[PDB]
Structures are given as C-alpha cells and as structure tokens.
C-alpha cells in the first residue's frame, strides 16, 4: 500500500492530504509555576556517567516544549533543541518561554544526532545550533527537512543529512539504526515569502530493539495510519498536545489532545510522551489544559495515563523492551 | 573647590577633561574554564533569607561583568545588570559570555534599585530590564544617566530617575541613603548617530554606615580625585580591570589594571572589588591577565590583595564596618 509521497506546487510545498485548507494562557508568579510546572534536573548533570543503551534501550528525557533527548540502541539524539530563552529572530520581540531550560549544552553529549521537525523558532533555533555545533562538530550529525541543508552548512554544520519524506539514513558508525524522515501536516517559514521553501515532517527512528516516533508539529491527517502500518509498532512515541486554541484556526496544523491520542493510536505505539505544552505561549489555551485534556481523550478512547503520559521538565523516563 | 562639572558640544556630551582624545583573548574548553573561572551558586539560592543590612552594611555579590548586588543600609541594589548571554542588538552576531551568569532575575530580591552607568549593550540589557520590571515593578526604582529616562520609559520602567553629574537623589521608602551620580570618562552608542547623546558615569552611594562607589566603565581622569575628596572615604568601590588591551586605543576609555589601583587611591576608598573582566571578551587580553596584572600593581604601590580582591562568580564578600 502507497504513501502520502509528497510533493509541490510549482515552488512550495503543500500538504495535499484533504485535512489541509489554507484558512488567555495566563501564567505568571514564580511560587505558582514552580509549583505546577517545576523544572527538574536532569540526572546527566549529578550523573554524567552513563547512558544511553542497555541493552535494549530506551530512556526519553523531556528538556521543554519539542525538544526531548533520547537513548537507544547505542545512541543519543536531541530533537528540535531550543536551549534560548526566546523562540525569535528577534531580541526584543516574540514568544519567551517561561520555564527555563531544565541543562545547558555544556552538559549532553549527542552521539552522533539531532532531528530538526521543521524551521520555525520554537523548533529551529540558531544560538541552539550554533552551541552545539561548536561543541561537537563533524561528530554530531544534523538529520533535516529537505530544503534546510544549506542554511544549515552555513551556521557551520558539517556533517548534515537533508531527506525528503519516506527518504532514509543513518549515523555511520551505527548502520543498524534507520532515521526516516515521514509525513506531517503543518508548515514553514522564517521570514518574508520563504513559506513552505523548506519540508515539515516527522522522524521515525529505527534500531533493533526499539523504534522511536516523533511527531513533530502537526495535526490531524493520514500519514500517521501510514507510518503506524509501515514502520510500527513502536516502542515510544513524543506527540504534541499544545498549541491548539482556538480550534477553527489552529486545526489544520496543531492537534489538540483529543487529536494527540488519535495519533498515537494509529501511529501503533507502545506508549507516548506529550511534548509542545507547558513552555511557550503560542495559542490561546490555558497552560496547563493541554495535560486536562489529555487525560480526558484518554478515558474516551479506553487507555491510561500509563500509556501516554506528561512528564516534567527535565525529567526521565526508561522504557524497558 | 569645584569639579569638572558636565557638559555638552552643542548636541551630545564629551568628556571635556584632557587625558580623552577622540582617537587574543582565547578561552576553550569547558573543563578549564570551570577550573579557573568557576561559576558559583550565590548565597540567596539555598539561603534566600536575610539579606542585606545588619545593622552597618555591607554586603556585595560578583554576578560577573560590571553586574554587582549590594546590601548596605537596609537596600539592596544591582548596578549595570545583564543577566543574558549575549551582549548585542542582534541574536546573530555580538558578544556571548564565556561564564554563564550565577543565577537568574527570578532569584533576588532589590530594594528597590538599580543603577545604570551607561547604556551600551553589555551594562544596559535589555532582556534583564524586561524582566526585572515585570518581576518588580513600581516598587523598583532604577537610577540612570541623563538622557536615559525615555528609554527606560519605553520599557515600561514607571519608577525612574535620570540624573546630571553631581545630582543626587534616594529611594523614597529609605531617604537616610544618598545615591549620587558621578562624573567618569568613557562614552555611550547604542545605534547609528546616537553617540553621546546619553551621559555616562559612576554612582556614589552614601548611607548612614557605608559608602559605596561603583566606577563604570572608564579610564583614567582627575574627577576619581574629585569624587575621592567630595565624598570619601568610601567603604567599598567596585572597579574595572578588564578590556583595556591594545593600550593605543583603549585607553582613553578603559583603565588597565594599574590605572584601576590609581582609582582605589583616588576615591579614598578602603576597598576595591574587580568588576569588568573575566565574562566577556570585549577586547585582546588573555581572559585571565587582569587580575595577574592586579596583583602586579598592587605590589608596586605597597598594598595588598586584602586591599583590592577579585571574586570568584557569584562570590559574596561581607564587610564589615570599620
Ligand atoms: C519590517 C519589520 C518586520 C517586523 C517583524 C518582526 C518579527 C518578530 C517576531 C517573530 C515571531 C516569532 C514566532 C515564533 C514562531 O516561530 O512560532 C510561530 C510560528 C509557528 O509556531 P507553531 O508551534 O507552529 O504554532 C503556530 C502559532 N500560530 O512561526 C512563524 O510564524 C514563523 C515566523 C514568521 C515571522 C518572521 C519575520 C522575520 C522578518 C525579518 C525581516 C527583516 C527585514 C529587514
Ligand atoms: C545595516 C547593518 C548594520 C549591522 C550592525 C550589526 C551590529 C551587531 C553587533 C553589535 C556589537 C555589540 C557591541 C557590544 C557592546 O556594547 O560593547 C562594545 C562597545 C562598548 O564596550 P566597552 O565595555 O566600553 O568596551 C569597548 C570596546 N571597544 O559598545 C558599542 O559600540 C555600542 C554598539 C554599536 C553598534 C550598534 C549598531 C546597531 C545597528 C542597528 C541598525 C539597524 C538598521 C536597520
Ligand atoms: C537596533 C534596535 C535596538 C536598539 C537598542 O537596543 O537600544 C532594534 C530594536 C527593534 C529592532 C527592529 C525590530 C523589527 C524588525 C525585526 C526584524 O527581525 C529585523 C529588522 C527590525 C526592523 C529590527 C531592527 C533592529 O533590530 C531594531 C530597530
Ligand atoms: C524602534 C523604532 C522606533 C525608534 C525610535 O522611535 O527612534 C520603531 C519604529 C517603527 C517600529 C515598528 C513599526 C511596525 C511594527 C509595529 C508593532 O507595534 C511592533 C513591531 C514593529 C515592526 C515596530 C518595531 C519598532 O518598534 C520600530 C522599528
Ligand atoms: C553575519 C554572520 C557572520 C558574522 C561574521 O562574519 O563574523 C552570519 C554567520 C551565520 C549566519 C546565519 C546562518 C544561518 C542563516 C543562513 C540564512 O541564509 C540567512 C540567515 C542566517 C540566520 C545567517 C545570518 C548571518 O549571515 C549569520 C549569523
Ligand atoms: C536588503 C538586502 C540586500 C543584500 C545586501 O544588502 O547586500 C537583502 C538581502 C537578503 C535579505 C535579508 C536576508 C534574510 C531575509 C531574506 C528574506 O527573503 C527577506 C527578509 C530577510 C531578513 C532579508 C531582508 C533584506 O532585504 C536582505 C538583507
Ligand atoms: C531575520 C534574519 C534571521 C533569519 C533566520 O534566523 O533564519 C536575521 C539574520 C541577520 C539579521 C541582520 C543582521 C544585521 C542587522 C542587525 C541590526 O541589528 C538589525 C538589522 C540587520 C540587517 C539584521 C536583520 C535580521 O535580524 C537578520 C537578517
Ligand atoms: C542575511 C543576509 C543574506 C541572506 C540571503 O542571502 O538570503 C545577509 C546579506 C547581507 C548581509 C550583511 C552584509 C553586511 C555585513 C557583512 C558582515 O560580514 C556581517 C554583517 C553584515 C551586516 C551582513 C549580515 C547578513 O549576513 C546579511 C544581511
Ligand atoms: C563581537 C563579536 C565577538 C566578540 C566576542 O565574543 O568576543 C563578533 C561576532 C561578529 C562580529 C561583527 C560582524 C560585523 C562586523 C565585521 C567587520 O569586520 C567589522 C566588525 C563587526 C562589527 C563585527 C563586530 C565583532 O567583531 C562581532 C560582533
Ligand atoms: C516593538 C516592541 C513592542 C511589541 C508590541 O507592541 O507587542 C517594543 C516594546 C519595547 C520597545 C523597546 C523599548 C526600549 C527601546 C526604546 C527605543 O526608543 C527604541 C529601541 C527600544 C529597544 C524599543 C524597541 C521596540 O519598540 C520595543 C521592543
Ligand atoms: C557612517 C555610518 C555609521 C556611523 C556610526 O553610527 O557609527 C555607517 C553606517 C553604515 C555605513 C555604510 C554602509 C554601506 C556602505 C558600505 C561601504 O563599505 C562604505 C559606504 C557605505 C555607504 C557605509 C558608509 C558609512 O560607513 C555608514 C553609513
Ligand atoms: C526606517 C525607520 C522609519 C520609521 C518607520 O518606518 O516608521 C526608522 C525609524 C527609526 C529607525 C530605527 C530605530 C533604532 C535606530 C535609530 C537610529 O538613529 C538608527 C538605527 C535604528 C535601528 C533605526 C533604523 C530605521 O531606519 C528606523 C526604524
Ligand atoms: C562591513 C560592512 C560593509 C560591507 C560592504 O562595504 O559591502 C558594513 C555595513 C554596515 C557596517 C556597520 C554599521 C554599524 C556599525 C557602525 C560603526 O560605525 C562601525 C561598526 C558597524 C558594525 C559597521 C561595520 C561594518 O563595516 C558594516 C557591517
Ligand atoms: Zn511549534
Ligand atoms: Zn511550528
Ligand atoms: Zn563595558
Ligand atoms: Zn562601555
């Protein structure tokens, strides 16, 4: 069976799966944040010494918003880092967030990857890259939409993959493990009519004891009934649940929970981690709604937190096989 | 006797003392670094509870670069405060420090000021304004050079003062504390064609047990000398000893570790802490030359580190009164 293979207008991208039309969060006080969203340390700062591995993967850490770090099959790899305070082009304007990055860069070490989703601040974050490039080098390879290759050769990148979707790869001194790059449907864009010049995707990672999905920022089409049926079942899932109020514009591109647990489903994992949520001030929900309405699709569709659960910022969680 | 007094060409302000005329650093390694410059946990993080005061001053806390707090005489006070990474109108490009800062705006507490010496990006932040007026508000007074008040305005800073050199004022609550501002040689830009057109300074602080005098960025002039005899003695003086390499050009604008000690002298005061140095890279000294050359002026004008000390990152000193 075929695949969303996608796909062009004569310049842009477009999404072409049907789902697609071209068509209040309140935080503050530290005392109140700390207790609702508190930020943990990450057990790599007291515990530098090991992870990933063993034997049979698979530890997930949340570091905020859409970026996770994950240790399986002999690697680590960091999805759509953003250690910056900002998601912006700007110093002086746009979303700040409000939990801190729970490490710095200078603690990690990524052998040898990260999964870019799309361009867009809060998931394509320049100081980010610029930090870890200087830190690793040529060791750390950069898996990235088509399209995003040289604005990633000219932050100083080296060692940099761009993949159109269905299209793979891997790291090469561990063959044994595939990245794919799959479908989504959202969007890019940094500045001035560069929208869609560069892919949107997913990223299904593949090893032999355990299979990762990361959804990126989407929502709700086929594709992911696609992945689930192609790749699948996998071990671990991060899906976003943030970023969806109000519903008549956000729908096409961001899932809300309700959508969040569709996905899951069809994508046939195991169990999923929320990410998106509780970082950034990007839509109009409530902060701390997103995890509400998790639990409540959750009921309706007959699973459990056990099956797709919130963590903290900076906190881990070990998946055994 | 009077003082240089300042002072404008007819648009921006110049120095107008005679010693101004118009006319390699290589850190790396993350392990190094934190063995030479390590990066400290203040006080107030496991220890929030009190400070300052108590009864008779004084408390100080290196939050790196020209970022001090003070606790004396019942306020506590942050000069010059940038608590971000990168010193720049621009993401892209622009100065990131090389020591991160000790801690962050949400932990703290100043009552109820701040003192800008001048705007230039890496002792006026605005990232660090923002926050700082959203944490306090109001209830946080910040004292800044002539020409500045707008700018702060346009933040949404309501509680500021703007002073000439010479001009005082205090926090309403706490009226027994004099914060004056005083003259400095150094020079204000933070776009195109603004040069000058904000003053730049020192800050004397005077309360009922403690003195403390923050130099800002500067080199060298009579008006330390100035300042040393109007007010003076100090108790404590917070002083720059980095970014002063190549000589020929910088100073005129930055002191070098010899001319900071001239400063301690100058301004009468019985101690000095570094401040500038060691978080940025802002001009070609090695990273860790100031303070050796600290030590070398120290010793040939007969004092002492005890006199004049640099502190770790995030350090706190205590001192006591007489
Ligand atoms: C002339 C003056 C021009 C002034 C413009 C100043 C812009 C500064 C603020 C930029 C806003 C950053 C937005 C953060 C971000 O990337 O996320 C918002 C959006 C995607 O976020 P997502 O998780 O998908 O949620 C969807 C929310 N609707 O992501 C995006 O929309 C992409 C950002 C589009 C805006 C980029 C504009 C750059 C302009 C530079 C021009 C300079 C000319 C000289
Ligand atoms: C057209 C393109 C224009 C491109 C310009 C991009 C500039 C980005 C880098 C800015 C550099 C930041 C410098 C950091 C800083 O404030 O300190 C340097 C200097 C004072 O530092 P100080 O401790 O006194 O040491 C002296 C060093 N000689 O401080 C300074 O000199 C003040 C900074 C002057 C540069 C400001 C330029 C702003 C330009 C915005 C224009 C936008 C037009 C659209
Ligand atoms: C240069 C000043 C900052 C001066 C200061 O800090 O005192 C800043 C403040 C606001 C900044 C502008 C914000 C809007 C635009 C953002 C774009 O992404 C790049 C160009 C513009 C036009 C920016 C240009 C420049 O980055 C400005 C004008
Ligand atoms: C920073 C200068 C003005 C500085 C000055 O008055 O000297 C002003 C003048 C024009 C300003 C822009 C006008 C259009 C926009 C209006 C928005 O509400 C905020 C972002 C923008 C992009 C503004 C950003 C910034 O506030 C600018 C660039
Ligand atoms: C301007 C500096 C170079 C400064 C120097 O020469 O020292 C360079 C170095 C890396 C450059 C960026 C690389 C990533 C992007 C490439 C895009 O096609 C244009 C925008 C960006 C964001 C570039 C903007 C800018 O051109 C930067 C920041
Ligand atoms: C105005 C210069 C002309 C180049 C030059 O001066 O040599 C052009 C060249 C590329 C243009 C910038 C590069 C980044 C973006 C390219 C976008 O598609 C339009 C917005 C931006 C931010 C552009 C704004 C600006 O118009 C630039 C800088
Ligand atoms: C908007 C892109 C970033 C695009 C991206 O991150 O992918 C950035 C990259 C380099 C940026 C330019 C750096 C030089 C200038 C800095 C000034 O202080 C404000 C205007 C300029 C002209 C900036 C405009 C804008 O801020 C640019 C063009
Ligand atoms: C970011 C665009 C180009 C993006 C593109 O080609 O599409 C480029 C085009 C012109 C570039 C500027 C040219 C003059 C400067 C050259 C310096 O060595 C780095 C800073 C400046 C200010 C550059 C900053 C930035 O690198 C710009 C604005
Ligand atoms: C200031 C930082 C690095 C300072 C540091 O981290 O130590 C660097 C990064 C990019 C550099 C700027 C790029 C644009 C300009 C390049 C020209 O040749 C003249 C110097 C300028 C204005 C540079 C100023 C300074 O050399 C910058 C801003
Ligand atoms: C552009 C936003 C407002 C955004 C909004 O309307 O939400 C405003 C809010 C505060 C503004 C800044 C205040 C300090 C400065 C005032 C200067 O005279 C022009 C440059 C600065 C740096 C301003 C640039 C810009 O005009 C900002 C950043
Ligand atoms: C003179 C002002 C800045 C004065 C300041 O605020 O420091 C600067 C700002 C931008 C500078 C221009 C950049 C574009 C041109 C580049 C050429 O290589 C020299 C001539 C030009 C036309 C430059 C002339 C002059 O060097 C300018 C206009
Ligand atoms: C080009 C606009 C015109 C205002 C508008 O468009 O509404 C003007 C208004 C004020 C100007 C900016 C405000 C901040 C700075 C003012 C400086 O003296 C020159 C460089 C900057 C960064 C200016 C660049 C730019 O040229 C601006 C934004
Ligand atoms: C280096 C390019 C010129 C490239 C060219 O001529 O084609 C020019 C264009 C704009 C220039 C900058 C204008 C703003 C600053 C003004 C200062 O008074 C000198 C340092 C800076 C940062 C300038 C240094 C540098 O010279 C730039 C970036
Ligand atoms: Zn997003
Ligand atoms: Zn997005
Ligand atoms: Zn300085
Ligand atoms: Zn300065």
């Known amino acids: ?17 049907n789902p697609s039309i071209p068509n209040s969060s309140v935080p503050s006080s530290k005392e109140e944040l700390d207790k609702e969203l508190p930020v943990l340390k990450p057990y790599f700062i007291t515990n530098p010494e090991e992870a990933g591995v063993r034997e049979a993967g698979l530890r997930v850490t949340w570091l905020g918003h859409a970026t996770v770090m994950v240790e399986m099959d002999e690697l680590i790899f960091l999805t759509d880092p953003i250690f910056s305070s900002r998601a912006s082009p700007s110093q002086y304007m746009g979303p700040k967030r409000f939990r801190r990055s729970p490490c710095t860069i200078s603690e990690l070490p990524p052998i040898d990857a990260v999964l870019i989703s799309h361009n867009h601040y809060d998931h394509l974050d320049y100081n980010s890259v610029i930090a870890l490039n200087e830190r690793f080098g040529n060791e750390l390879r950069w898996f990235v939409p088509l399209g995003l290759l040289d604005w990633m050769q000219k932050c100083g990148c080296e060692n940099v993959i761009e993949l159109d979707w269905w299209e793979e790869n891997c790291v090469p001194g561990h063959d044994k493990v595939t990245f794919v790059f799959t479908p989504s449907q959202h969007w890019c864009k940094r500045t001035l009519m560069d929208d869609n010049k560069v892919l949107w995707g997913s990223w299904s990672v593949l090893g032999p004891w355990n299979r990762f999905f990361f959804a990126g920022d989407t929502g709700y089409c086929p594709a992911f009934e696609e992945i689930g049926k192609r790749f699948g079942p996998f071990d671990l899932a991060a899906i976003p649940i943030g970023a969806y109020e109000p519903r008549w514009f956000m729908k096409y591109q961001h899932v809300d929970p309700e959508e969040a647990v569709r996905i899951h489903t069809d994508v046939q994992t195991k169990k999923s981690m929320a990410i998106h949520w509780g970082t950034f001030a990007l839509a109009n929900e409530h902060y701390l709604e997103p995890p509400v309405k998790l639990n409540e699709a959750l009921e309706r569709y007959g699973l459990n937190a056990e099956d797709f659960f919130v963590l903290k910022h900076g906190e881990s969680r070990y998946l055994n096989n």
Not at 1 to 17: H, Y
């Open 1 to 17: 069976s075929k695949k969303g293979k996608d796909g062009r207008f004569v310049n842009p991208w477009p999404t072409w799966k």
